[model samples]
Target: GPVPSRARVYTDVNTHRPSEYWDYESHVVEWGNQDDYQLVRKLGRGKYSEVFEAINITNNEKVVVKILKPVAAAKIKREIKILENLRGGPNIITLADIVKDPVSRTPALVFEHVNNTDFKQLYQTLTDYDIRFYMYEILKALDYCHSMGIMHRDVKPHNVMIDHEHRKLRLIDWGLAEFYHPGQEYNVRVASRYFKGPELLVDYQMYDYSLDMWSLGCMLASMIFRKEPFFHGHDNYDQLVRIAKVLGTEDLYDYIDKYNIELDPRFNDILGRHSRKRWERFVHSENQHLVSPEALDFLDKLLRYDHQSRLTAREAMEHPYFYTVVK
Candidate 1:
């Protein structure tokens, strides 16, 4: 058993809204006409579903159509419900329509498409200001969602869509997003391995919106450090190993002790005690253009082992690193 820790900011966001706003299990969804949209080509595929670039026949505009595979009806409704609630939030991907096939009843979600460039190539090409601009854009999305009592369990670069030409960004993929109910124990299995926060790896379930900040921190670190995965772990157990190598084992135990966390036994085999790696160590000529004092300070705040210590999206946007960006 672990000590209970609450988010440092916006902890009671859902309490202000009606039950209908956060209750997805009981929400009923209305399906739209499938004929209005037609698939153009496959966009990509994931374990749960496949996505396609579809065309809205009526408006003659392109849209991203996400086709759900064999998943629980409840999850589909939950994703739809969260989207409906966060439909107009800042930088959130808009849910254009929900459609299902008449025969198989296969469901699909349509979203207004973005001409997104591949994150790998795009990040390498971005000027320092471009990175700041888009990072701020995503923080706006995170701040809006947290204020509305939702935690985007997934917040990797892949889930962030950017239209560099138009200077637009949208936080995509709400499949893992959930409403924040205080003191509720959540599944630690959420978020990708590299982007997973210390609380999740340590099996502490009473987490909050700060989880997204950790993931965002990883995204920012990878960009500035030129590491594909800022935390490169071979597996789940080694995930903590990689994290400990950077944040240091002593600091990790402090976080563990603070939260009363019981480290997974598997980590003991591979997670040898490591000293804290300074943010300065990551800077080099290749990534020198991307690194700066403000950037290192920003990364340090976000990548803390104590989840509560990580900067909230709003706080991060106001950091001096972003002062060079804009208002």
Candidate 2:
């Protein structure tokens, strides 16, 4: 169930009334006609939209219908465009149909739904082999996405769906994805705080597909240890401190020389606050021992202080940590 938040959450509720009468801009689309689809149960609720498990009454098949208000229509259109162009393996979710509201003329995207539970629930019950296989599937999915020049900006547990009966993993949620042109610079950091990569935490606009790999590493870590993914913070500064606690702080001169990356002038005080020795101690501390070998290897590559040093999804798939882990 969606946690109760402030009244602000309900502001959009009236725009997409899900009460006794299903009346909203979403209900006005071509497929929005009640005769075309029947909403069974609400699958989930997002920041600005609601997803329902709907049946195509006309076709007699099940599909996940995502209804967004007029305010979110632009974002929905962008995601739908991206989904239409994305080419990947079975590990990636497929878009089926798109419906627009007849009244306010809002857009709705329909996608194939995995009947099984997602990563969060799977991590709670699956075995080690199951976990590894799942990670492998995720790697394969990202590898395909990167190859297609697509970077999935959001890669949290909730976005990963599993086909348990077939033992498959499907990566979902591309609401924030962007197509990167060759040599084009990226600058937006639109993902969960905890699973975000170090480079993104530093400056999202300068990051690339490598950010997705970082989140994937965090997910793998959570699976192996049965623990929370990564350090989540209330804000940027707090998140950075949490990251520093885990990965340790680098010497200013060393960081500048090794990574050729500069920190904002405002961060100088933060840099001066922690000693390099403290960072070394933190990385080597017993706290890190809880991480599995594959998890550590992935984390080290994922959380590199230098963005250029981060591992590509393709390279990670071929690493010994992934191939020979269970053998």
Estimated TM-score per prediction?
A: 0.97, 0.77
Summarize candidate 2's per-residue lDDT along 1-327 as a digit string, tens digits.
111111111123223433322212232223445347677898777876788898887888898877776556765645665576563464888877777645436667777767866545666677655666677788888877666556788888888888887876778877777654434456645788877766666563545677787678777655555457556666776776666656557533453455455555766566344442322232433334434565566656766554456678777777766664453
Q: How many collisions per candidate?
A: 0, 7
Computed on alpha carbons, the lDDT of every model, listed in order, comes to 0.89, 0.63
Return the top candidate by lDDT. Answer: 1
Q: Model 1, 183-258: lDDT tens per residue?
A: 9999999999999998888889999999999999999999988898999999878888999989899999899999
Off by over 4 Å in 2: 1-35, 102-104, 118-120, 183-187, 251-294, 324-327
Best candidate, TM-score: 1
